[PDB]
């Protein structure tokens, strides 16, 4: 169904420790396909997925060229914001930039966005309409007035609705075997006595893709969202994902509690329960 391409830029000043570190990473939905590391030896946008490697030399010359320029801009930006906030050249600060486009089943532009942050906090974001900006504070306001006069939103827009989707469609096609598949979650359940009086039921879900998924526990057809442990969805590392949800129940009710798996990768929701 829906698809997206997102890029993430992180710059961290390092007073005394030399010039700032600039790291970049490209994601097509839940798959990273490229990266750039101002510290590495290559100094080239590098591939991080099989399907993207097939792009030719001029693609990589272009990405490295455009990424270098992007890091130079964030390097000056780093010293500029230090001033806007009257900080010393002693601490290390960070600038984060994330932007991308979303397309629906027919690969037609759906949503587009761009947001920048300073020291983990919002700085300036492009509005939903892709025509104006939203500044977080007075320092960000300086940048806003300028970007509005320099027509920055228009360049961002022409890209989000244009090349951004153009490349997402080409990526979704050149790497179908990875990007368009849907790996359903291989379920399973475990029980661990806590005591002769209580025990823990853990609902597993490994090797699934995309990451989107929902594990929920129920009391005879009643969901219990406040006595159940649930961890953050995590990367197995092979490209797939995993997750589990737990619950603590009396020594006699392990047939009153059902766990439901839901993932676009499986025709019908699962209703696991111990035995």
């Amino acid at each position: 169904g829906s698809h997206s391409m997102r890029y993430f830029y992180t710059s961290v000043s390092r007073p005394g420790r030399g010039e700032p570190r600039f790291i970049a990473v490209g994601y097509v939905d839940d798959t990273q396909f490229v990266r750039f590391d101002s510290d590495a030896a290559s100094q080239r946008m590098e591939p991080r997925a099989p399907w993207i490697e097939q792009e030719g030399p001029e693609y990589w010359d272009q990405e490295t060229r455009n990424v270098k320029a992007q890091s130079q801009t964030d390097r000056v930006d780093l010293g500029t914001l230090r001033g806007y906030y009257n900080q010393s050249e002693d601490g290390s600060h960070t600038i984060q930039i994330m932007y991308g486009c979303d397309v629906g089943p027919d690969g037609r532009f759906l949503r587009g966005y761009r947001q920048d942050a300073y020291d983990g906090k919002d700085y300036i974001a492009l509005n939903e309409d892709l025509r104006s900006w939203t500044a977080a504070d007075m320092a960000a306001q300086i940048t806003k007035r300028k970007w509005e006069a320099a027509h920055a939103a228009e360049q961002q827009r022409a890209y989000l609705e244009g090349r951004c989707v153009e490349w997402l469609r080409r990526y979704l096609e050149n790497g179908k075997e990875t990007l368009q598949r849907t790996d359903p979650p291989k379920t399973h359940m475990t029980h661990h006595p806590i005591s002769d009086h209580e025990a823990t039921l853990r609902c597993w879900a490994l090797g699934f893709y995309p990451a989107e998924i929902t594990l929920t526990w129920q009391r005879d057809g009643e969901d219990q969202t406040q006595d159940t442990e649930l961890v953050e969805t995590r990367p197995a590392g092979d490209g797939t994902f995993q997750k589990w949800a737990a619950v603590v129940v009396p020594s006699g009710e392990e047939q009153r509690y059902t766990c439901h798996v839901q993932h676009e990768g499986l025709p019908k929701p699962l209703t696991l329960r111990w035995e």
Binding site: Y7, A24, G26, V34, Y59, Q62, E63, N66, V67, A69, Q70, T73, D74, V76, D77, T80, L81, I97, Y99, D116, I124, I142, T143, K146, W147, A150, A152, Q155, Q156, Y159, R163, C164, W167
Partner: peptide, 9 residues
């Protein structure tokens, strides 16, 4: 791929 027109802040 990536955006090539980011302006200074």
């Amino acid at each position: 791929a990536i955006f090539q027109s980011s302006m200074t802040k």
